[PDB]
Design a protein around this ligand. Sequence first.
Ligand SMILES: *[C@@H]1O[C@H](CO)[C@@H](O[C@@H]2O[C@H](CO)[C@@H](O[C@@H]3O[C@H](CO[C@H]4O[C@H](CO)[C@@H](O)[C@H](O)[C@@H]4O)[C@@H](O)[C@H](O[C@H]4O[C@H](CO)[C@@H](O)[C@H](O)[C@@H]4O)[C@@H]3O)[C@H](O)[C@H]2NC(C)=O)[C@H](O)[C@H]1NC(C)=O
Ligand SMILES: *[C@@H]1O[C@H](CO[C@@H]2O[C@@H](C)[C@@H](O)[C@@H](O)[C@@H]2O)[C@@H](O[C@@H]2O[C@H](CO)[C@@H](O[C@@H]3O[C@H](CO)[C@@H](O)[C@H](O)[C@@H]3O)[C@H](O)[C@H]2NC(C)=O)[C@H](O)[C@H]1NC(C)=O
Ligand SMILES: *[C@@H]1O[C@H](CO)[C@@H](O[C@@H]2O[C@H](CO)[C@@H](O[C@@H]3O[C@H](CO)[C@@H](O)[C@H](O)[C@@H]3O)[C@H](O)[C@H]2NC(C)=O)[C@H](O)[C@H]1NC(C)=O
Ligand SMILES: *[C@@H]1O[C@H](CO)[C@@H](O[C@@H]2O[C@H](CO)[C@@H](O[C@@H]3O[C@H](CO)[C@@H](O)[C@H](O)[C@@H]3O)[C@H](O)[C@H]2NC(C)=O)[C@H](O)[C@H]1NC(C)=O
Ligand SMILES: *[C@@H]1O[C@H](CO)[C@@H](O[C@@H]2O[C@H](CO)[C@@H](O)[C@H](O)[C@H]2NC(C)=O)[C@H](O)[C@H]1NC(C)=O
Ligand SMILES: *[C@@H]1O[C@H](CO)[C@@H](O[C@@H]2O[C@H](CO)[C@@H](O)[C@H](O)[C@H]2NC(C)=O)[C@H](O)[C@H]1NC(C)=O
Ligand SMILES: *[C@@H]1O[C@H](CO)[C@@H](O[C@@H]2O[C@H](CO)[C@@H](O)[C@H](O)[C@H]2NC(C)=O)[C@H](O)[C@H]1NC(C)=O
Ligand SMILES: *[C@@H]1O[C@H](CO)[C@@H](O[C@@H]2O[C@H](CO)[C@@H](O)[C@H](O)[C@H]2NC(C)=O)[C@H](O)[C@H]1NC(C)=O
Ligand SMILES: *[C@@H]1O[C@H](CO)[C@@H](O[C@@H]2O[C@H](CO)[C@@H](O)[C@H](O)[C@H]2NC(C)=O)[C@H](O)[C@H]1NC(C)=O
Ligand SMILES: CCCCC/C=C/C/C=C/CCCCCCCC(=O)O
Ligand SMILES: CCCCC/C=C/C/C=C/CCCCCCCC(=O)O
Ligand SMILES: *[C@@H]1O[C@H](CO)[C@@H](O)[C@H](O)[C@H]1NC(C)=O
Ligand SMILES: [Zn+2]
Ligand SMILES: [Zn+2]
Ligand SMILES: [Zn+2]
Lengths: 195, 291, 98, 47, 49, 65
Amino acid sequence: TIISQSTNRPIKKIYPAFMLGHSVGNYTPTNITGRYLNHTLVILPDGCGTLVHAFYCILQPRTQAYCAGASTFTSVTVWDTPASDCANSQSYNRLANLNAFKLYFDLINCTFRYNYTITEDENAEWFGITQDTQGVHLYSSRKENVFRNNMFHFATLPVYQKILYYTVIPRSIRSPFNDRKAWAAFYIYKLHPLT
Amino acid sequence: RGEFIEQATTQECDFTPMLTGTPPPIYNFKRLVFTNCNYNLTKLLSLFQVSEFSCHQVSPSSLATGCYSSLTVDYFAYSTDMSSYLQPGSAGEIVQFNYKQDFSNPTCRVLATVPQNLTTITKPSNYAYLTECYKTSAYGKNYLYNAPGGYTPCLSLASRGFSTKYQSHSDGELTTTGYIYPVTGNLQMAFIISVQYGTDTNSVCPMQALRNDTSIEDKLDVCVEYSLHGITGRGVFHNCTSLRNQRFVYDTFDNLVGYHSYNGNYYCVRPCVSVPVSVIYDKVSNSHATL
Amino acid sequence: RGEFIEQATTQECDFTPMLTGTPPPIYNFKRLVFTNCNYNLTKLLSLFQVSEFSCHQVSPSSLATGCYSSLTVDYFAYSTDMSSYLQPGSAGEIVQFN
Amino acid sequence: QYGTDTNSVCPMQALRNDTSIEDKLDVCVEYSLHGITGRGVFHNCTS
Amino acid sequence: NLAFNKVQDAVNANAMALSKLAAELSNTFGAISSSISDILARLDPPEQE
Amino acid sequence: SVDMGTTGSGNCIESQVQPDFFETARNTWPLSIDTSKAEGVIYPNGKSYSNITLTYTGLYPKAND
Ligand SMILES: *[C@@H]1O[C@H](CO)[C@@H](O[C@@H]2O[C@H](CO)[C@@H](O[C@@H]3O[C@H](CO[C@H]4O[C@H](CO)[C@@H](O)[C@H](O)[C@@H]4O)[C@@H](O)[C@H](O[C@H]4O[C@H](CO)[C@@H](O)[C@H](O)[C@@H]4O)[C@@H]3O)[C@H](O)[C@H]2NC(C)=O)[C@H](O)[C@H]1NC(C)=O
Ligand SMILES: *[C@@H]1O[C@H](CO[C@@H]2O[C@@H](C)[C@@H](O)[C@@H](O)[C@@H]2O)[C@@H](O[C@@H]2O[C@H](CO)[C@@H](O[C@@H]3O[C@H](CO)[C@@H](O)[C@H](O)[C@@H]3O)[C@H](O)[C@H]2NC(C)=O)[C@H](O)[C@H]1NC(C)=O
Ligand SMILES: *[C@@H]1O[C@H](CO)[C@@H](O[C@@H]2O[C@H](CO)[C@@H](O[C@@H]3O[C@H](CO)[C@@H](O)[C@H](O)[C@@H]3O)[C@H](O)[C@H]2NC(C)=O)[C@H](O)[C@H]1NC(C)=O
Ligand SMILES: *[C@@H]1O[C@H](CO)[C@@H](O[C@@H]2O[C@H](CO)[C@@H](O[C@@H]3O[C@H](CO)[C@@H](O)[C@H](O)[C@@H]3O)[C@H](O)[C@H]2NC(C)=O)[C@H](O)[C@H]1NC(C)=O
Ligand SMILES: *[C@@H]1O[C@H](CO)[C@@H](O[C@@H]2O[C@H](CO)[C@@H](O)[C@H](O)[C@H]2NC(C)=O)[C@H](O)[C@H]1NC(C)=O
Ligand SMILES: *[C@@H]1O[C@H](CO)[C@@H](O[C@@H]2O[C@H](CO)[C@@H](O)[C@H](O)[C@H]2NC(C)=O)[C@H](O)[C@H]1NC(C)=O
Ligand SMILES: *[C@@H]1O[C@H](CO)[C@@H](O[C@@H]2O[C@H](CO)[C@@H](O)[C@H](O)[C@H]2NC(C)=O)[C@H](O)[C@H]1NC(C)=O
Ligand SMILES: *[C@@H]1O[C@H](CO)[C@@H](O[C@@H]2O[C@H](CO)[C@@H](O)[C@H](O)[C@H]2NC(C)=O)[C@H](O)[C@H]1NC(C)=O
Ligand SMILES: *[C@@H]1O[C@H](CO)[C@@H](O[C@@H]2O[C@H](CO)[C@@H](O)[C@H](O)[C@H]2NC(C)=O)[C@H](O)[C@H]1NC(C)=O
Ligand SMILES: CCCCC/C=C/C/C=C/CCCCCCCC(=O)O
Ligand SMILES: CCCCC/C=C/C/C=C/CCCCCCCC(=O)O
Ligand SMILES: *[C@@H]1O[C@H](CO)[C@@H](O)[C@H](O)[C@H]1NC(C)=O
Ligand SMILES: [Zn+2]
Ligand SMILES: [Zn+2]
Ligand SMILES: [Zn+2]
């Protein structure tokens, strides 16, 4: 566990989150870099690892405490409560991360809103994203057979402006003091035009 | 030869954004992508008065009777008298800073006039296009040119709007200039259409090609023309018993050898001339036999 | 890959005869030949409203970014509605006598 | 007309002297020398 | 000497094969130029292919 | 403007930024791309192939990245 260098727990799989946009700037109050301007593509997992969101809207910072528009802002962190949200597979909270994200920004003029269902498991998997004229393309290894490492196309997003930047959204799990689980790290490899 | 057509049922493609509202300027063109839907092309084309069309590696008639994997359309307001500036290889400002047509896929260029009775489309005040887009440098102006099918880098600056001829907007390193002139008479528009053909099923088909003439059971022993999910050809289907969730089987040399049909049977696919034939001929008796 | 460009310095090509005075008839067309000079093609093209262009073994965009040994231009007054009579293979009087 | 020798008729947009060949010796580059274009590698030679 | 001449004939054949291979790169084969760079510089993508 | 749900109300939870605890030497577990297992390879769109070797020019990661 990163927070406590002594305790050791079995490793669990966790999904990442990203923000992709066309222009970047500063968070005006704190002068912290990493603010996406105009229409921004956001990919957010939710539902205790059973759902993933995808929307393309303008992020309007909120001036409340510890939010993007305040002077006490440090980072955009999405959280969830396993005790309440992930109590059981029947009462999974599908909007916990989305509700956490809405506290940082007001969502304005969103072009679309998509979601995809993910079967809960512990197998390793791969995720990819590209873009061409048709739009933004998503790839996954859970499409055909999760026990093979090949990635297959499963979605196309209507984003046509050229994407130049992306930023990983950090996650922090508010687990109780009993569990205090450990989360698997993920790795990002850049694609290149190759034979 | 008989016929054999199998097509899935899909919803209608949404062309309402193009048929309602005010078309955008050329530098801020609107793009629509259609997958897994059907369209009534006759209805769409009737709404417009076409002045010219130019297609590459495809024909307009074929676009009304064939299936594709994807359909992309870019449209914007454009005066017909500036048609030459949209032609491939033009040296004008339209190609440099507004729109460059891409030729990596089969495509068509259509110019048309909006009739008066088509009141759902609203006329803009003026036609507009950019004259230059550059970055200030020590040597001079560092012009930025549009990639094929892409947007101009000065798009954000151009969003501020132009109220007079040769009005310039700058935000520091970037500077752009625009040109406007009033719209007279009926509105005129442009349409850049591109299509892609996939080796798998093609889910974008016109309504005129939507049919289920899957009478293959009665046409087993006959050379027929088949059109199965966008795959066309000629062959003979033989009853056969037989990798993944795919309806088509191909050999190493990319020949279609097997098909899975809607009825539930599996058919072997062979060309209409497949059985070898040899003739034994005797010159003395003028007799012949077949093997 | 990098870049490596070397070009000599020359004077400006004189296009003033074409931009001043009255253009001649088609049968008495004016010819200009340019060698060892540079031209500002953007300035020239801006002065005119092009209705049509047809090039052979070259493109107009390439003519604004490439060097040549010689440049020849023939110009005359001509109505646009008679464009078909200037097309290759025409059977009209324009090709035969003008 | 295109000549195999130097082409002395060039547009003003193509008038440049980016002759930084000394720093680009050990690299494949696109060259445009007096109307002659191509790709290649330049090696210091005596002649 | 005919036998001595055949040795020079063999040498000339070896030279001729490489001469044929080298000379074919300078032909345009009906194109506007024998260089791909010239074709890309003088023409646009619809006509370059 | 599609419906994105109920607007958020309240205060954002504070977060502590300590990059030293995350980018230390003890928490370094390198994993390179293994081309023998075809890791990070996107399957070509449309059609499948079986028992064949093909050459493709597209977007792929570098070996041992
Ligand atoms: C996965 O993604 C899908 C698609 O984006 C989401 O489905 C949408 O869910 C939202 C709620 O989050 C729905 O919005 C609500 O729709 C009600 C009825 O809408 C009618 O009209 C629309 C437009 O034609 C149709 O799509 C729809 O079928 C109906 O005919 C409204 O009554 C609601 O308004 C009320 O709630 C909002 C809450 O924000 C208030 O602001 C309003 O004042 C009012 O009280 C609301 O707009 C939306 O219609 C759904 N779309 C579709 C296509 O189904 C899924 O929710 C999402 N799944 C997740 C995140 O788990
Ligand atoms: C983490 O662990 C889970 C659970 O698997 C169990 O615990 C492991 C520690 C091992 O001891 C496993 O043997 C044990 O079952 C792993 O998920 C499981 O992966 C295996 C790997 O083969 C799956 O087996 C497959 O199961 C299907 C069932 O139809 C067959 O078709 C296949 O031939 C094959 O046998 C197994 O089903 C799967 N279980 C679940 C519930 O998903 C997981 O892979 C592992 N993760 C990592 C990264 O090691
Ligand atoms: C593609 O769109 C066109 C135009 O919308 C469709 O054609 C139209 O079809 C309707 C319904 O069949 C016709 O309406 C009928 O018209 C007659 C005219 O006498 C009338 O008696 C009936 O009561 C009825 O209203 C309509 O005329 C016809 N229009 C034209 C111009 O042909 C067409 O069907 C669509 N194609 C597909 C494949 O859906
Ligand atoms: C080719 O010809 C054109 C047109 O003559 C040249 O562009 C022009 O360049 C001049 C001098 O740089 C510009 O004048 C300046 O304009 C600004 C406008 O705000 C003004 O602030 C300055 O005081 C000055 O007058 C002129 O605007 C510009 N015109 C256009 C239409 O771009 C061009 O430089 C020539 N090219 C070459 C390579 O010589
Ligand atoms: C974003 O903030 C950074 C600092 O966090 C700004 O960089 C400063 O720029 C000013 C003005 O040139 C300099 O005086 C400072 O020294 C810079 N600070 C640092 C730490 O380098 C940056 O300009 C801001 N960007 C925008 C677009 O506002
Ligand atoms: C994208 O966001 C930027 C920054 O928020 C917007 O740029 C502003 O635009 C207004 C209106 O034209 C200008 O008056 C401001 O000076 C600009 N601000 C900055 C910091 O550049 C821009 O308008 C947005 N893009 C679009 C298409 O609305
Ligand atoms: C979101 O879209 C709305 C509706 O298109 C925009 O609201 C318009 O804003 C302009 C510019 O300020 C006003 O002149 C219009 O009157 C507004 N229209 C309506 C119907 O309210 C709005 O600007 C967009 N929000 C952004 C870009 O942040
Ligand atoms: C042609 O017939 C096939 C087979 O009946 C149709 O496929 C069915 O489509 C319906 C909806 O219309 C689905 O509920 C069924 O599950 C489909 N069956 C199978 C086996 O896939 C197909 O839609 C028809 N195509 C037409 C009428 O254009
Ligand atoms: C590029 O640089 C060369 C080398 O300096 C220039 O050639 C010189 O041109 C001047 C006049 O501008 C003559 O007086 C010199 O004799 C030339 N030198 C040589 C070695 O020939 C050339 O003009 C420059 N080209 C540009 C600036 O376009
Ligand atoms: C009407 C202009 C007359 C030009 C007279 C002399 C020109 C010297 C060289 C010119 C290069 C060819 C430009 C062709 C432009 C066609 C229209 C376009 O593609 O934009
Ligand atoms: C409008 C004329 C109609 C002619 C009707 C019958 C013609 C018999 C044969 C004609 C030869 C072809 C002439 C084509 C001329 C094209 C215009 C031009 O290149 O000048
Ligand atoms: C941010 O930078 C501005 C200058 O642009 C400065 O006035 C302000 O105090 C800075 N804010 C913080 C929190 O450092
Ligand atoms: Zn896609
Ligand atoms: Zn048979
Ligand atoms: Zn060398």
